């Protein structure tokens, strides 16, 4: 779709992180991996399904025009959503043991004091935590 | 027998419209699967994207 | 609850979809109307489609489950709008008129077997000015009776 450069670069980053064989498709694999990766269970059949469902020249895999044309097509409830993957507390604050959670579920095997350090950083205000607006300032928008 | 020919009319109109219904009803189906699925991939690449933003700092 | 005209109407139509007399309208079945018709879907979409009307989930739409499908709203229906829909279907040529072999084309998409003399019969019964065609006013006449 017709979007800024920037938001182009963004999905290509998003897509990068999928396709983890670099070959420029994702396959059904790859998907479930990211998938089960951020708490989620689904079977191979519903895999297919999700990749059928986005593969528009039907060969099985998704390609980066295909996956453009996913992320492309009210507009700040998705901040709070990737917030929510963060916060398991649903406390408004992401804790040391919450982030490192998720980002050792993503293979970034972070020792606890990479995490600390992690969490040192983002934390404007030293409560020892991150809130929404802490949260949002990383990811610059 | 004009209620028979009146009657014949209304069928044919109703068929019609009957599947146009069956398909309808799957254009719904189709539409509510397809905006699920979507939603789903888009969560789980903003929840990466959020990630890499904390590697990135 | 519909007049006990309707819902004989809806069972002229029901057994129309319903070839072999069973009850039970089946993906086959269904599929044989819909291409006579000029539709053509997958087997899949015949399966989906029967999916969502099969209440009882028991594989086959019966009369209760096709009455309900016929008495549903849905939203692009504001009942003039199915009327004018069906009108453009039978008036193939958009030219605001049903002609006899218009009607006959429609007749032999629905399988029906009707002599040409027998659609004759049928523009005539409809036909309220004489001009041996039917517009959308005497369409409407019909089917809002
Ligand atoms: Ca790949
Ligand atoms: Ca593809
Ligand atoms: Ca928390
Ligand atoms: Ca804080
Ligand atoms: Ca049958
Ligand atoms: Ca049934
Ligand atoms: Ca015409
Ligand atoms: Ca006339």
């Known amino acids: 779709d017709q979007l800024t450069d920037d938001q182009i ?10 396709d983890k064989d670099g070959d420029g498709c994702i396959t059904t ?6 998938m089960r990766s951020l708490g989620q269970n689904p079977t191979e059949a519903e ?12 060969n099985g895999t998704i390609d980066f025009p295909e996956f453009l044309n996913l992320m492309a097509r009210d507009s700040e409830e998705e901040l709070k959503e990737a917030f929510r993957v963060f916060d398991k507390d649903q406390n408004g604050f992401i ?3 919450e982030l490192r959670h998720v980002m050792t579920n993503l293979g970034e095997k972070l020792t606890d004091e990479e995490v600390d350090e992690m969490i040192r ?3 404007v205000d030293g409560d020892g935590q991150i809130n929404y607006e802490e949260f949002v300032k990383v990811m610059m928008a | 027998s004009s209620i028979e ?3 014949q009319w209304r069928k044919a109109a109703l068929v019609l419209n009957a599947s146009r219904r069956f398909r309808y009803t799957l254009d719904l189906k189709k539409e509510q699967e397809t ?18 933003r904390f590697m990135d700092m």
């Open chain 1, 9 to 18: 670069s963004e999905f290509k980053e998003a897509f990068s992180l999928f």
């Open chain 2, 35 to 52: 905006r699920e699925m979507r939603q789903k991939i888009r969560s789980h690449a903003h929840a990466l994207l959020a990630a890499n």
């Open chain 1, 95 to 97: 804790s040391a043991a």
């Open chain 2, 5 to 7: 020919r009146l009657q």
């Open chain 1, 29 to 34: 694999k790859e998907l479930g991996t990211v």
């Open chain 1, 121 to 123: 950083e983002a934390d």
């Open chain 1, 47 to 58: 895999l297919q399904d999700m990749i059928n469902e986005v593969d528009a020249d039907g």
